[PDB]
Amino acid sequence: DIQMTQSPATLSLSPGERATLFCRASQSVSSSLAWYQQKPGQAPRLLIYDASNRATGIPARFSGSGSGTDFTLTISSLEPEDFAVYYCQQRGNWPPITFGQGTRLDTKRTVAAPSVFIFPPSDEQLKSGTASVVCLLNNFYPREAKVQWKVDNALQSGNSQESVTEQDSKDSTYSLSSTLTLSKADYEKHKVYACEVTHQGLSSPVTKSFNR
Amino acid sequence: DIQMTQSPATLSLSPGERATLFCRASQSVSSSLAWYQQKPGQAPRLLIYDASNRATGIPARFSGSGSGTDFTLTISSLEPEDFAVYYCQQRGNWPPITFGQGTRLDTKRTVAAPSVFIFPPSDEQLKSGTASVVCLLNNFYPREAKVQWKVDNALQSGNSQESVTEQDSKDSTYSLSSTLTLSKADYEKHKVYACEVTHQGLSSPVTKSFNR
Amino acid sequence: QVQLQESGPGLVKPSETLSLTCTVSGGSIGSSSYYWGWIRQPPGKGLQWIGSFHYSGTTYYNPSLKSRVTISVDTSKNHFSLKLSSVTAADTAVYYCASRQNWNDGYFDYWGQGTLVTVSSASTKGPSVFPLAPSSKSTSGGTAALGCLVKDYFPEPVTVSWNSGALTSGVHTFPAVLQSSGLYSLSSVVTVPSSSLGTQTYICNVNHKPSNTKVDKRVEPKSCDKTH
Amino acid sequence: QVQLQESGPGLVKPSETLSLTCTVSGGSIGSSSYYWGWIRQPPGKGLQWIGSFHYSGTTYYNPSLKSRVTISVDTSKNHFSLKLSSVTAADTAVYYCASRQNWNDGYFDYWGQGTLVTVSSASTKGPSVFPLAPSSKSTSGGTAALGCLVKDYFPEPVTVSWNSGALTSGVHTFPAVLQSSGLYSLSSVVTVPSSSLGTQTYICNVNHKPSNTKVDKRVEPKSCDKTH
């Protein structure tokens, strides 16, 4: 089998300035790769085939090159509609047909700290035998952040879920939701709950807590 | 599409006295406008078509005028079958056929304060897990009144329904009913429940309450 | 000179087809050059236009409602008909068939007796009576209101009387209002002086032919005032 | 040149056979020398190649799926079909049928619009509306977030709006996720100053056409935690 590694995982560039995307192969495939562009909710559209030749109907502002295992795509001028996920495909030895993990093309405004809140469970959930603690980050940039759930300083793993939104078209931020789901009696067993977040826009780890 | 409106929403003129209604169109319709009269429980009757033209079987009381975007309907004297709901219809550009929201003609009665009284929920509804509070405003004019529900000095709204009866055939007043439905737990947790009424016949907003 | 008669089932559920018929008497479907048509009026609201049939065979419908509505005619028994595929609960309304004898235009001059068609609830549920008894805490120095509420019934209307209809003066009823559960409530009340409670016993008689339910409820002073 | 239209049952219980049909328009299936193929993409992940049908009749399949996948063609109805026996919950994804008109190589340049296939075995249960009401204790200087959660419902999508769509500023909706129950959970929240809570009514409207369920719910702070 052949592996595709795309780099960097997420890119953040403004419209009108050049973008470079790197792809590396576990095995040499000469020059037999295609790179595709996919938008949320839409079928992926191929952009480059054979790593140098442009596909039909592809503006000249996109180009690609490379050899062996190292390949690059250059976009001379980003358009507002060009922010989408980009995929690397190899055909050097197929099947299998192996695709890259994808890359994210993001834009400014620069880093901003999230507005952070924590939600204790509602009463209808409490009387139903379940419980959920919510930690929300709003209007933060860029998307990566680290979230941890502490319940009376007890180690927690495998009992939390996280959800991310897309980049907002206006404020250029993201939204994070972290849910800790427990049973009612389990929730009453402990007393103090805390959500801990680290982000590049926060000078120090920020832990917020409430009491049952 | 073409949209047009009427004015005023509700008009109050005593019988035997000249009355006027306005209809305004968002775009020019030349003279392609018609006035219809509708009595409750009865099919609407055409009154004026094309403006300044009286349909068959219609007395000279009603007179239409206007053009372009503005049309007026004038009744020289109001006899007591002239009180109904009046609509404007356009053929300047149809389909779609666009009607007005309708206007109501009132009788210019003396303004009188309502008799506001509260029926608290009884055990027959409380045993079912719900509660229904009734707020009756009897023998008031004009029909317009603002009814709010207040619980423990905290306003409750959006979960109650209102009804206004027909103008009485004896003294030409109105009666209003307000019904507030609450859950059993919410009813138990709260102690005081009040209906607050603002009306033109009332010197100040009047609050009538009962304590659980 | 021309009479229009409407007919339909009245009671349906969501997602089936509402079928309505308007028949013409004193004339013909192939009468002079003018329109036939259907409009609707939701209860307590304004009139809304469904569509029109032109005598030349051309049909017109409201653009936002034409996707489910259809107008047809037949000369053999001489009527026209409206079909609304996959009706929803929001379409409960009094429907009218209308015509324009003089001239030919979008106006309407001849009308039938539009019928109320409902889309929710069931016709088999019989009413229950909720007594409304006055009390000394409720009496404002000689004024009392007694009554009975008709609840958990369908279809409306239901006939409500006091003492087999012998009491009509001072009896006041209200239009029934549909609830979210699909049931109606109708209040029949009497405003009296507080002294009349101890002389006449009040009997609320609720009779409902569609459910074949006859209920007599006795109105008495509130029992919660005893020293228990 | 050519258009492709995917279809399929959409809702398939685990362990049965998923059957998808891609019909070709604008030309014949054997129009030239090129490939046909099927691509699938799980939500939030990359695309996966299931198999391809070469015009000469040779068919290639992904080794990890070849034991379960069969791709066939039929020029009688001018379409090809993909069959996957013994599906699992992990097979829920968006499927595409594609071809490579220019040059006889393994790429794809004509794509049809994908269709979502879900494997959960849940019995199209109606939505549950939970009012994510705000609280005064967690007030961050007068501004708080209020919303509604749609839980334990099936299938996608569920229509969530605010004030019948009138409130759009500051409104955010989150894509639904599948729990370890076979049912979805979705959230829709808006962040507003707490001062306007007592004068503006906030209504979450939830429409589920497959269950024909419409729920409107009012959002206000819980009275047990109000500033009394």
Spatial separation of the C-alpha atoms in residues B128 and A67, rounded to whole Å:
77
Cα distance between residue A182 and residue A127, in whole Å: 13
Across-strand partners of A87?
A: A36
Distance CA B182, CA B210 (A): 15
Contacts of C170 (CB under 8 A, 6+ apart): C190, C191, C192
Work out whether strand D69-74 and strand B145-151 pair parallel, antiparallel, or are unpaired. Answer: unpaired
User: Which residue in the set A43, A138, A165 is minimally distant from D174, CB to CB?
Assistant: A165
Identify whether the C-beta of residue D59 lies closer than 8 Å to the C-beta of residue D53: yes
Give dist(CA A108, CA A170) in Å, integer.
Answer: 10
Half-sphere exposure of A90 (CA within 13 A, CB side): 29
**Torsion sign over Cα C43, C46, C48, C52:** positive
The answer to whether D46 touches A99, Cβ cutoff 8 Å, is: yes
Measured between alpha carbons, how far is A123 from D66 in angstroms, rounded to an integer? Answer: 51
Cα-flanking dihedrals φ and ψ of residue A126, to 5°? -65, -40
Is-contact A43 A105, C-beta < 8 A? Answer: no
User: Which among D38, D34, D21, D29 is positioned nearest to D2, based on CA atoms?
Assistant: D29
Q: In this structure, what token pair is assigned to residue B194?
A: 């009040």
Cis ω before D155 (30° cut-off from 0) = yes
Distance of alpha carbon B104 from alpha carbon B110, whole angstroms: 17
Distance of alpha carbon B58 from alpha carbon A96, whole angstroms: 85
Measured CA to CA, the distance from residue B87 to residue B67 in angstroms comes to 16
Asked whether the beta carbons of D193 and D143 are under 8 A apart, the reply is yes
Residue type, B169: S
> Three-state secondary structure along D151-192?
ECCCCCCCEEEEHHHCCCCCEEEEEEEECCCCCEEEEEEEEE
Nearest to C47 among B44, B49, B123 (CB): B44
Residue with tokens 């040499």: A28
Beta bridge partners of C184: C153, C178
Residue carrying the six token digits 């079912």: B128
Q: Judge whether A103 and A85 are in contact, CB under 8 Å.
A: yes
How far apart CA A80 and CA A61 sit, in angstroms, is 13
The structure tokens listed for B41 are 């429980």
Closest CA to C176 of C156, C201, C152: C156
Q: Are strands A70-75 and A45-49 parallel, antiparallel or unpaired?
A: unpaired
User: Is the C-alpha dihedral spanning D166, D172, D174, D175 positive or negative?
Assistant: positive
Other C-beta atoms lying within 10 Å of the C-beta of residue B65: 13
Question: In three state form, how does the secondary structure of D71-134 look?
Answer: EEEECCCCEEEEEECCCCHHHCEEEEEEECCCCCCCCCCEECECEEEECCCCCCCCCEEEEECC
CA-based R_g, chain A, Å:
22
**Count, residues in chain D:** 228
Choose among D84, D94, D75, D59: nearest CA to D24. Answer: D75
Instruction: Identify the residue whose tokens are 């941890």.
Output: A148
Rounded CA separation A148/D83 (Å): 43
Residues B113, D35: Cα–Cα separation, whole Å: 83
CA distance B83 to B17: 12
* Distance in angstroms between the alpha carbons of the first and the last residue of chain C: 72
Backbone angles phi, psi at B180, to 5 degrees: -115, 120
No. of H helices and E strands in chain D? 0, 17
- Contact criterion met (CB < 8 Å) for C107 and B46: yes
Cα–Cα distance measured from residue D152 to residue D213, given in angstroms and rounded to the nearest whole number:
13
CA angle, D27 then D33 then D39, to 5°: 75
If you compute the radius of gyration of chain B from its CA atoms, what whole number of angstroms results?
A: 22
Give the separation between CA A58 and CA B46, rounded to whole angstroms.
63
DSSP 8-state secondary structure symbol assigned to residue C36? E
d(CA C110, CA D36): 64
Q: For C161-205, give the secondary structure using H, E and C.
A: EECCCCECCCEEECCCEECCCCCEEEEEEEEEEHHHHHCCCEEEE
Task: Collect all residues of chain B within an 8 Å Cβ-Cβ radius of residue D226.
Answer: 154
Of D201, D226, D228, the CB nearest to B157: D201
C-alpha D95: how far from chain center? 11
Give the whole-angstrom CA distance, residue C108 versus residue C127. Answer: 40
Helix/strand/coil for D20: strand
Query: Which residues make Cβ contacts (< 8 Å) with residue B145, sequence separation at least 6?
Result: B114, B137, B176, B197, B198, B199
Q: Do the Cβ atoms of A161 and A134 come closer than 8 Å?
A: no
| Size of chain C, expressed as the number of residues it contains | 228
Instruction: Provide the CA C225 distance to its chain's centre, in angstroms.
Output: 40
- HEC letters along chain A: CCCEEEECCEEECCCCCCEEEEEEECCCCCCCEEEEEECCCCCCEEEEECCCEECCCCCCCEEEEEECCEEEEEECCCCCCCCCEEEEEECCCCCCCCECCCEEEECCCCCECCEEEEECCCHHHHHCCEEEEEEEEEEEECCCCEEEEEECCECCCCCEEEEECCCCCCCCCEEEEEEEEEEHHHHHHCCEEEEEEECCCCCCCEEEEEEC
Paired strand residues for C19: C83
Q: Distances in Å between the alpha carbon of C149 and those of A192, C169, C172?
A: 51, 18, 12
Are residues D216 and D158 in contact, defined by beta-carbon separation less than 8 angstroms?
Answer: no
The answer to whether residues C77 and C25 touch, using CB atoms and an 8 Å cutoff, is no
User: What is the DSSP track for C50-103?
Assistant: EEEE-TTS-EEE-TTTTTTEEEEEETTTTEEEEEESS--GGG-EEEEEEE--SS
DSSP track, chain B:
---EEEE-SEEE--TTS-EEEEEEESS--TT-EEEEEE-TTS--EEEEESSS-BPTT--TTEEEEEETTEEEEEESS--TT--SEEEEEE-SS-SSP-B---EEEE--PPPB--EEEEEPPPHHHHTTTEEEEEEEEEEEBSS-EEEEEEETTEEE-SSEEEEEPPPPTTT--EEEEEEEEEEHHHHHH--EEEEEEEETT-SS-EEEEEE-
Instruction: Name the minimum distance, in Å, from the CA of A91 to any CA of chain D.
Output: 7
What DSSP character marks residue D194?
G
Grouping H, G, I as helix, E, B as strand and the rest as coil, residue D140 is strand
Strands B10-12 and B103-106: parallel
**Residue A63 to residue A75: CA distance in whole angstroms:** 6
CA C194/CA C8 separation, integer angstroms:
49
Cα(D120)–Cα(A50) distance, rounded to whole angstroms? 40
- Counting every residue, how long is chain B? 212
Chain D neighbours (≥3 Cβ pairs under 8 A) are: A, B
DSSP character at residue D29 = T
> How many Å separate Cα B57 from the centre of its chain?
29
Angle (nearest 5°) at CA D32 between D31 and D36: 85
* Chain B environment of C140 (Cβ under 8 Å): 117
The CA distance from A48 to A64, in Å, is: 7
Dihedral angle sign, alpha carbons of residues D35, D40, D41, D47: negative
Q: Which residues pair with A66 in a beta bridge?
A: A71
Q: In a 3-state reduction of DSSP, which class is residue C5?
A: strand
Chain D residue closest in CA terms to A170: D170
Give the closest residue to B49 by CA, choosing from B69, B70, B63.
Answer: B63
The partner residues of B184 in beta bridges, in order of sequence, read none
Give the A-side interface with D, CB within 8 Å.
Answer: 34, 38, 43-46, 49, 55-56, 87, 89, 91, 94-97, 99-102, 115, 117-120, 122-125, 136, 138, 161, 163, 165, 175, 177, 210
Q: Tokens representing D137? A: 């204790």
Nearest to C105 among B91, B122, B124 (CB): B91
CA dist B137 and B114 (Å) reads: 5
> Does the N-terminal peptide bond of residue C221 adopt cis geometry, omega within 30 degrees of 0?
no
Residue of D138, D143, D179 to mutate, testing the A interface (most A Cβ within 10 Å of its Cβ): D138
* Burial class, B66, CB count within 10 angstroms (exposed 0-12 / middle 13-18 / buried 19+): middle
Q: Going by DSSP bridges, is the β-strand pair C159-162/C202-208 parallel, antiparallel, or unpaired?
A: antiparallel
Chain-centroid distance of CA C198 in Å reads 38
CA distance B165 to A85: 62
Give Cα separations from D14 to A160, A163, B35, B99, D92 (angstroms): 27, 26, 63, 54, 10
Contact C95, C114 (CB under 8 A): yes
Q: Which of D172, D128, C162, C10 is nearest to A130 (CA)?
A: D128
Q: Please, are residues D69 and D51 in contact by the beta-carbon 8 Å criterion?
A: yes
Q: Which of D201, D203, D223 sits opposite B190 (nearest CB)?
A: D223
Q: Please give the torsion angle defined by the CA atoms of residues A134, A140, A144 and A146, in that order, rounded to the nearest 10 degrees.
A: -40
Q: Which residue has the tokens 């329904």?
A: B161
How far is residue D138 from each of residues A52, B103, B161, D148, D201, measured CA to CA in Å?
56, 48, 32, 18, 21
A46 vs D102: CA distance, rounded Å: 13
Residues 6+ apart with CB under 8 A from D141: none
Structure tokens at A106: 């993001």
One-letter amino acid of D227: T
CA dihedral C40, C45, C46, C48 (to 10 degrees): -30
Q: List the subunits that have 3+ CB pairs under 8 angstroms with B.
A: C, D
Structure tokens at A90: 């190899």
Resolution (A): 3.3
What is the distance in angstroms between the Cα of D130 and the nearest Cα belonging to chain B? 16
Instruction: Specify the amino acid at residue A149.
Output: W
Q: Cα(first)–Cα(last) distance of chain B, in Å?
A: 54
The token pair that represents A85 in the structure block: 């996920």
C-alpha B100/C-alpha C48 separation (Å) is 11
The answer to whether the beta carbons of residues C103 and C128 sit under 8 Å apart is: no
